[PDB]
Design a protein around this ligand. Structure first.
Ligand SMILES: Nc1ncnc2c1ncn2[C@@H]1O[C@H](COP(=O)(O)OP(=O)(O)OP(=O)(O)O)[C@@H](O)[C@H]1O
Ligand SMILES: Nc1ncnc2c1ncn2[C@@H]1O[C@H](COP(=O)(O)OP(=O)(O)OP(=O)(O)O)[C@@H](O)[C@H]1O
Ligand SMILES: [Cl-]
Ligand SMILES: [Cl-]
Ligand SMILES: [Cl-]
Ligand SMILES: [Cl-]
Ligand SMILES: [Cl-]
Ligand SMILES: [Cl-]
Ligand SMILES: [Cl-]
Ligand code: NA
Ligand code: NA
Ligand code: NA
Ligand code: NA
Ligand code: NA
Ligand code: NA
Ligand code: NA
Lengths: 327, 327
C-alpha cells in the first residue's frame, strides 16, 4: 500500500478535502506537430503531475495544509507514482481509490517549443468511473470522508459532474464550507445542472470565462466581474471570488461590498496551473483562520510566484519563498 | 525487487537473450487528429506494452522460451509494470536495468478509428541511456549475460546503435547465434555503421524496406528479395530471412538456394507487432532444435495468427491456442 491509512480514532483526519482529478501529464517536445500517419521522435520528454484536483491539493499541501485527496487512479504504476507524489507534497492519500479496470488519468501533451504551440489529448481514464454511486459505496454514503472535523471541501469540474455536485451538496448539508472552482469551463448542459446546486456552494471561485458561462454576464474586467458576483449571489452563492489573471481577483464576502485586488507585477513565464495554485492556497489560508479577503490576497501572491516559473506543480511555492506576513 | 534474481550456479540462465527496447504504449483513440493548438478528449484509452525488443522477447516467452530481456527502464511505476508484465509473459528480467534519472520509454500513439490513421511520438527516455559503457559496467564486460550455454541473441534497432552492434559482436565472438532485426529501418548513417558488423550477424531478418536500405537492392517481391539475400551473404551474413507481410517470407540457410514461403491467408484485423512476433517465434523454434526453415515456417504461422486480433503483444499466441502441428 503506497496510500496512507486512516486510524480508528481519526487522529490524522484532514481540515481540507479535495474531491477531484488526478492526471499525469505526459509531455513530448517535438520539432513539429505530427501530420496524419506520421511516426516521429520527441526531442525531449517531461512527466508532470496534474489534474486540477491534485494541483489544488498540492498547492495547499506544499504550504503545510492538512489536506486529503479523494480521487480515482489505476492500480497501474502511474497510479502508485501519483499516490507517492501526493504524500511527498503533504497530501493524505488514504481516500484515493484505485481501479483495476482503467488506467490512471493522463493528458498527452505535444509541445513545439520553436512555434510555442501545443496539442493536448485528455484521457480521464479511471476518472470517468469516479461516480457518486462508487464514491458512496466506498465511503459509507460519504461518512468515511465527511467526518465532523472537516472544515473545507474543494471541488472542480474535472470529474463526473454528478460526483462534484452530490459531494458539494452532502458536504454543505454537514456544515462543511464548500469551494467549487468550475474548471474546466462548464458546457451549456453542465451550466444548467450546476445552477440549482449553487445554494450549496459556500465559495464559488471561477475565472472570467467560467463566470461568463455561468451567469450570462460577459466578464472581461473588474466592473463586469462585479456584475457577475451579483448574479452569483442571486443564484445563492454565499462567497464569490472571480480570478482575473494578471488583473488579480474580485470578491465579495457574504454579500458585503465587492473588492478588487490587482495582480502582482511579476515576469509571467508560464501561468499553467496558476488558478489551481490560487484556489488551493486560498483554502489553506482560510484553514489557518484568514478571512476570505486575507486568504485571497495571500493566494494572489502565491499564484503570482507560480506564474514566474514553468512546471505547474513544480512552480507552486513553499512557505520559505513567501514574503513576511503571508503565512 | 520486481525483477528476477540469477542463481550462483546459472541454473536459470536463458537460451535466448534479447538486448533491446521496452516502450509503454500510450494509446489515445480520438474522434479526429488534434489540430495545432487544440485541446480535446480521447474517446477511449488503452495502455499497452511495446518496444520491438520486449515484443520479440514476449513472442518467444509466450511459446515457452527460456528468454531473458536486457534493457533499460525507469525506477518509475511504468518500469515496474513492465518488469512484472515480462515475467507474466515468460521473460526473465534479472538484466533489466533501472535508472532513477529517466522515465521509462514510451510511445504516445493517437488513433483515429474512423480513418484508422495514427500519429506516433516516440519518447525513448531511459532507453537513450542504454549504452555499451553502461551495459559493460553492469555485466562485467558482457560476461554476466553472455554465459557459455547462451544459444541466441536477438537485437533490433530501437536502442542506441552502438549497444546493438557491440553486443552482436561480443555474442558472435563467443559462438552465440546472433539475430538482428534492423527495425525501425536504419538511417543512411546507421547503414554505414551496421555494414562492417554484418559478419557478426548469424541471421539478418529485415522486412522489404529494411533489406532495401541495407543492400541497395530495391525489394518489392520474391525475385528481388532473392537478390537482396545474395547481397547480404556478400556483406557477410550467414543466414538471411526477409519478411514480406502477407506474402510470408524468403530465406537462405548458410548460402543455399533461396526459398519463398507464402503468407497464410487470414483476415488481417491488426498487423501491429506481427514482425516482432515472427522474429521472437522464429528464434524460440530454433531454440527448440528446429532448423531455420522449419522455425520460419512456424513463425510465419504465429505471425499470421497475431494479425487476426488487435492488441500487439496480446495478439501473440500461447501454445494452447495454436492449431495442432505448429508447436
Ligand atoms: N500574468 C500574471 N501576472 C500576475 N499574476 C497572475 C498572472 N496570471 C495569473 N496570475 C495569478 O493567477 C491567478 C489565476 O489566474 P487565472 O484567472 O489566469 O487562472 P485560471 O483562468 O483559473 O487559470 P491559469 O491562470 O492557470 O491560466 C490570478 O488571479 C493571479 O493571482
Ligand atoms: N496480412 C497478413 N496476412 C498474413 N500474414 C501476415 C500479414 N501481415 C503480416 N503477416 C505475417 O507477419 C510477418 C511479418 O510481417 P511484416 O513483414 O509486415 O513485418 P514488419 O515489417 O517487421 O512489421 P509488421 O508485420 O508488424 O507490420 C509476415 O512475414 C507474415 O508472417
Ligand atoms: Cl496503494
Ligand atoms: Cl510535476
Ligand atoms: Cl482507461
Ligand atoms: Cl526491480
Ligand atoms: Cl499489451
Ligand atoms: Cl525521461
Ligand atoms: Cl493474452
Ligand atoms: Na508539510
Ligand atoms: Na499536509
Ligand atoms: Na480502492
Ligand atoms: Na507557473
Ligand atoms: Na512458460
Ligand atoms: Na520463459
Ligand atoms: Na495483431
Amino acid at each position: 500500500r503506497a496510500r496512507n491509512v486512516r486510524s480508528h480514532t481519526g487522529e490524522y483526519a484532514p481540515d481540507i478535502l479535495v474531491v477531484g482529478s488526478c492526471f499525469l501529464d505526459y509531455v513530448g517536445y517535438v520539432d513539429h506537430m505530427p501530420q496524419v500517419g506520421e511516426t516521429m521522435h520527441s526531442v525531449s520528454f517531461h512527466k508532470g503531475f496534474g489534474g486540477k484536483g491534485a494541483n489544488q491539493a498540492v498547492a495547499a499541501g506544499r504550504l503545510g495544509a492538512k489536506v486529503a485527496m479523494v480521487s480515482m487512479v489505476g492500480t497501474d504504476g502511474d497510479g502508485s507514482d501519483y499516490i507517492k507524489e501526493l504524500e511527498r507534497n503533504g497530501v493524505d492519500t488514504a481516500y484515493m481509490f484505485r481501479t483495476g479496470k482503467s488506467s490512471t488519468g493522463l493528458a498527452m501533451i505535444l509541445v513545439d517549443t520553436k512555434s510555442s504551440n501545443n496539442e493536448i489529448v485528455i484521457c480521464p481514464n479511471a476518472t470517468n468511473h469516479f461516480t457518486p454511486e462508487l464514491l458512496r459505496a466506498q465511503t459509507n454514503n460519504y461518512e468515511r470522508i465527511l467526518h465532523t472535523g472537516l472544515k473545507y471541501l474543494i471541488c472542480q469540474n474535472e470529474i463526473p459532474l454528478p460526483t462534484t455536485l452530490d459531494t458539494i451538496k452532502e458536504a454543505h448539508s454537514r456544515g462543511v464550507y464548500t469551494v467549487f472552482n468550475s474548471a474546466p469551463a462548464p458546457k451549456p448542459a453542465e451550466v444548467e445542472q450546476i445552477k440549482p446546486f449553487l445554494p450549496y456552494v459556500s465559495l464559488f471561485c471561477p475565472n472570467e470565462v467560467e463566470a461568463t458561462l455561468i451567469t450570462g454576464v460577459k466578464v472581461t474586467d473588474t466592473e463586469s466581474a462585479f456584475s457577475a458576483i451579483k448574479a452569483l449571489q442571486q443564484l445563492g452563492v454565499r462567497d464569490v471570488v472571480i480570478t482575473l489573471g494578471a488583473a488579480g481577483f474580485v470578491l465579495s464576502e457574504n454579500g458585503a461590498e465587492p473588492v478588487h485586488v490587482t495582480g502582482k507585477h511579476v515576469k509571467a513565464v508560464d501561468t499553467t496551473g496558476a488558478g489551481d495554485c490560487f484556489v488551493g492556497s486560498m483554502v489553506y489560508f482560510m484553514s489557518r483562520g484568514r478571512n476570505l479577503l486575507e486568504a485571497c490576497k495571500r493566494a494572489n501572491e502565491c499564484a503570482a510566484i507560480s506564474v514566474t516559473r514553468k512546471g505547474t506543480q513544480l512552480s507552486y511555492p513553499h512557505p520559505s519563498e513567501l514574503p513576511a506576513g503571508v503565512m
